[PDB]
Amino acid sequence: SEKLVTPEDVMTISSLEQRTLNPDLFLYKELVKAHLGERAASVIGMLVALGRLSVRELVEKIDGMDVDSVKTTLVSLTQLRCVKYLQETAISGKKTTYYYYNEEGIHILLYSGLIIDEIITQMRVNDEEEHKQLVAEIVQNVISLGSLTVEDYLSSVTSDSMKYTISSLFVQLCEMGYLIQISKLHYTPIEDLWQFLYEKHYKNIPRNSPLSDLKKRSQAKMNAKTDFAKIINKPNELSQILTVDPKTSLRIVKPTVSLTINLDRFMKGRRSKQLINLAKTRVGSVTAQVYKIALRLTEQKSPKIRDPLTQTGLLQDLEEAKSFQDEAELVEEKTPGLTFNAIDLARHLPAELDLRGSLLSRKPHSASLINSHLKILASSNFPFLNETKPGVYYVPYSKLMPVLKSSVYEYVIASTLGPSAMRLSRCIRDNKLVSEKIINSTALMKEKDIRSTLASLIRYNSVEIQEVPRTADRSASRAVFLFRCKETHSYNFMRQNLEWNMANLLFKKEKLKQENSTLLKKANRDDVKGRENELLLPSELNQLKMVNERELNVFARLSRLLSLWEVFQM
Amino acid sequence: GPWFTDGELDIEFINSLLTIVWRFISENTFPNGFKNFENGPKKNVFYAPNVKNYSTTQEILEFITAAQVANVELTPSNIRSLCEVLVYDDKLEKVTHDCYRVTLESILQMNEEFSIFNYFKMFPASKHDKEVVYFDEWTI
Amino acid sequence: NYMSNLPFGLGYGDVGKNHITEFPSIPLPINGPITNKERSLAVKYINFGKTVKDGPFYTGSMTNDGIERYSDKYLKKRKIGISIDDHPYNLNLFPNELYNVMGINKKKLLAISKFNNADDVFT
Numbered sequence A: 001s002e003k004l005v006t007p008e009d010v011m012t013i014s015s016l017e018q019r020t021l022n023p024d025l026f027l028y029k030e031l032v033k034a035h036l037g038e039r040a041a042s043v044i045g046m047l048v049a050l051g052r053l054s055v056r057e058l059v060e061k062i063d064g065m066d067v068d069s070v071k072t073t074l075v076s077l078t079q080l081r082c083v084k085y086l087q088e089t090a091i092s093g094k095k096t097t098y099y100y101y102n103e104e105g106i107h108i109l110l111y112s113g114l115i116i117d118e119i120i121t122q123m124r125v126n127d128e129e130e131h132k133q134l135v136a137e138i139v140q141n142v143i144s145l146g147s148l149t150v151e152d153y154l155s156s157v158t159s160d161s162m163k164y165t166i167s168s169l170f171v172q173l174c175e176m177g178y179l180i181q182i183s184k185l186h187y188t189p190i191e192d193l194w195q196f197l198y199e200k201h202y203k204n205i206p207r208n209s210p211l212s213d214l215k216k217r218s219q220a221k222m223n224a225k226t227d228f229a230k231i232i233n234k235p236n237e238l239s240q241i242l243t244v245d246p247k248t249s250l251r252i253v254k255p256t257v258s259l260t261i262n263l264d265r266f267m268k269g270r271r272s273k274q275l276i277n278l279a280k281t282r283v284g285s286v287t288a289q290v291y292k293i294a295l296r297l298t299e300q301k302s303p304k305i306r307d308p309l310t311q312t313g314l315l316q317d318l319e320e321a322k323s324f325q326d327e328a329e330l331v332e333e334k335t336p337g338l339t340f341n342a343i344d345l346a347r348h349l350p351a352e353l354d355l356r357g358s359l360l361s362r363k364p365h366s367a368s369l370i371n372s373h374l375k376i377l378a379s380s381n382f383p384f385l386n387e388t389k390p391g392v393y394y395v396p397y398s399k400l401m402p403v404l405k406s407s408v409y410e411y412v413i414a415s416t417l418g419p420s421a422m423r424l425s426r427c428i429r430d431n432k433l434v435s436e437k438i439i440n441s442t443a444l445m446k447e448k449d450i451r452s453t454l455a456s457l458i459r460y461n462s463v464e465i466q467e468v469p470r471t472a473d474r475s476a477s478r479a480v481f482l483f484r485c486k487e488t489h490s491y492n493f494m495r496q497n498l499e500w501n502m503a504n505l506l507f508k509k510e511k512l513k514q515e516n517s518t519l520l521k522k523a524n525r526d527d528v529k530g531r532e533n534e535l536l537l538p539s540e541l542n543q544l545k546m547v548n549e550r551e552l553n554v555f556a557r558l559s560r561l562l563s564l565w566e567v568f569q570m
Numbered sequence B: 001g002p003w004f005t006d007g008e009l010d011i012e013f014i015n016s017l018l019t020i021v022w023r024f025i026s027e028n029t030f031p032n033g034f035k036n037f038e039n040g041p042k043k044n045v046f047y048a049p050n051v052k053n054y055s056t057t058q059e060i061l062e063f064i065t066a067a068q069v070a071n072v073e074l075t076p077s078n079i080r081s082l083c084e085v086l087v088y089d090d091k092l093e094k095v096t097h098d099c100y101r102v103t104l105e106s107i108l109q110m111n112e113e114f115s116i117f118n119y120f121k122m123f124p125a126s127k128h129d130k131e132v133v134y135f136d137e138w139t140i
Numbered sequence C: 001n002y003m004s005n006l007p008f009g010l011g012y013g014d015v016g017k018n019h020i021t022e023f024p025s026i027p028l029p030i031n032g033p034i035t036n037k038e039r040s041l042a043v044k045y046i047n048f049g050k051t052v053k054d055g056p057f058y059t060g061s062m063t064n065d066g067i068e069r070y071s072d073k074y075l076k077k078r079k080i081g082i083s084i085d086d087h088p089y090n091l092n093l094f095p096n097e098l099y100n101v102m103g104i105n106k107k108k109l110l111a112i113s114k115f116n117n118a119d120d121v122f123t
Helices: A007-013 A023-035 A038-050 A055-061 A067-079 A103-110 A112-123 A131-144 A150-154 A160-176 A190-203 A213-232 A263-282 A286-297 A318-334 A342-346 A367-378 A401-417 A419-430 A436-442 A447-458 A487-515 A517-524 A538-569 B012-028 B057-067 B076-088 B105-110 C036-053
Strands: A085-089 A095-099 A147-149 A179-181 A258-261 A386-389 A392-394 A464-469 A479-484 B092-096 B099-102
Touching (some): A023 C036, A131 A147, A131 C036, A147 A150, A190 A213, A263 A401, A263 A538, A263 B105, A286 A367, A342 A367, A401 A487, A401 A538, A419 A447, A419 B076, A436 A447, A436 A479, A436 B076, A487 A538, B076 B092
Antiparallel strands (some): A464 A479
16 A cells, blocks of 8 residues: 555445445346436335335335326336236235336346347348348347337338348247247246145135145145146247238238247356357367257257246245256156257258367267267266267256356356365365365365465355364364355355446446536437547547447446356356 | 475475376377367367276376386375376366376366356456456455 | 464564455456457447437436527427337236326337447447
């Protein structure tokens, strides 16, 4: 410190006012205030802070809003799929609508340009002259307006060829499952839906049963479970291109229903991308292309990132937890669409895989070569691929996502605290529980650096310190201390840390754009946009380029933070 | 053991031992030793998944004893401990008891879409920027 | 006496200085420069933000005089803003009490469309 800083300097320069807010609240509020206005931000803030709220409670809590402003804000939030609702009736018959917050709309606001980029990449249309611009604009219009009907969007264009291309491109986008029909299912909470289904299937059982209460509960639960599995996957399978041949023997998306962005398929794509990035580390570069093709062939039929049955509050029963794990292993192994052989992957390799001298067994997209690639995938340390039968392969999402979590966390902690952090973390993750001397014997490096690095790891919850007393009353003065690794605490802590960093970035960006509103407003409107040179002064050019450069860096770092934060949701 | 010098564990001699054993495992597991991984990753060729390409602890014993760079005769238990140190630091990988192969992340650590896995490449930002991200910011 | 039991690894000089740094000094591996694809991604983010902020769902932030002059003649506001009720609405998705502010009777008209192949950065 060249000169000591007063607490005024700490408050002004260093972000300390921002360290006292929850990462979830701070992230959601900054995102909503960045995209929508301040009223939506305040409504979402009180919704997250106090939980479930009704319209009267929202009027009472938030200061400065009447009922009309609150209802306008709620309509704006509800169009963008940002607030869920449930209509609840009491004993007196007074029906009231409670409002919640749902993750999906906020994540859409946080995944916008990435969704556009991924759908551009997954378009895969050869020789596009105007189609790319059209897909980009239809995706942007869908995300911005929350949900739209195809007929209402078609009326904005009058020419025939572009309307035909609208029809073809919407059919293409719905075919793989990126734009799905919306309904009241996406606006009711999963917990409330499961509670209603369970209660209806429990009250429906005939009374005066001479059969046991616990197994009656489990029977109603199983019927509610199978109906839950039927209802959640209903829009996922097919609900918008079911119509065939309206006129002239063509397939068109239904001109009666509104489409909405399907976020969970985009999560499937991002998990596939993370697996590709992991596979680019142990084995291969062309082999990475092979594993990428293998994932992209099976990206649509992939299981959920989080099982909706897991959020239903049914984890207290250990038997149901084991049943969920076994059902996951059931579906991931013998789904009728996730099993493939060499020949199925033969017809998808582009004209860039050579494979003439790709391998040396000694110490033209053929079946033997692709089989050898799939085998060297099958022999890797992490379970990238598994064989239910020699020749057919399935990717074990149930036994690879923890592995990807561990690898990403270890590389992050190594890049931010040094290779000593990797060494200690792996040493205390391999061994289940160690003292200090076992570390000093097994991990061959100096004593004081072990103590320093391990002390620094406690601050971010990489290791948990376990006390063992040697006295009648417990004390650390004469006790022996063991060191463990609890994966759950660490993963949660770094997830919230990355959420906080993302929200800090967006808050700084919002402050930068708010403080320099004059120049941005002067350059914003269309008659100068693109020809800023003639009217602006020399200093204004530097100021505008500085603002834009900082904005681009902020959003690029936000994308790079998402690339590490998506892994810890799984 | 032989790691201690004057009653304290050293790091230079241990690092030399780890370097030579990792070089040997690189020579045996990936083809041509390090000679294929030179230049870009485009031209590298890997062995078929039906070969006995790993080296066991006895192979390390033989190679280091022939080299005589460790100045005291060493035990297979020391070899197992050293390979455990390497597999801790993500230098090699174990599939079977006393069976190790060199990985590929370590090779890239010597000498495009963002991946956390290759953190050695991309540089820290130029100073005097107010939108710099610190992992240490939230806790303290 | 109190300050007389120092542990094995410290001397009398290290203690007596309680300045824990409030500023951070540990960066992440995400901090680097911007590439071309990342530039296109940032352009997509900023274009989406600028589109939505002027869109039909914004909400407020919570001369300009009423005197009768004659500069108002043949002079008109440079744009007509879009309200909450000027968009197609699916009647089934929205709840029941929210039907007041939104316009069921009023005609559903607006469906915008915009995308640019040219970067909106002045650098």
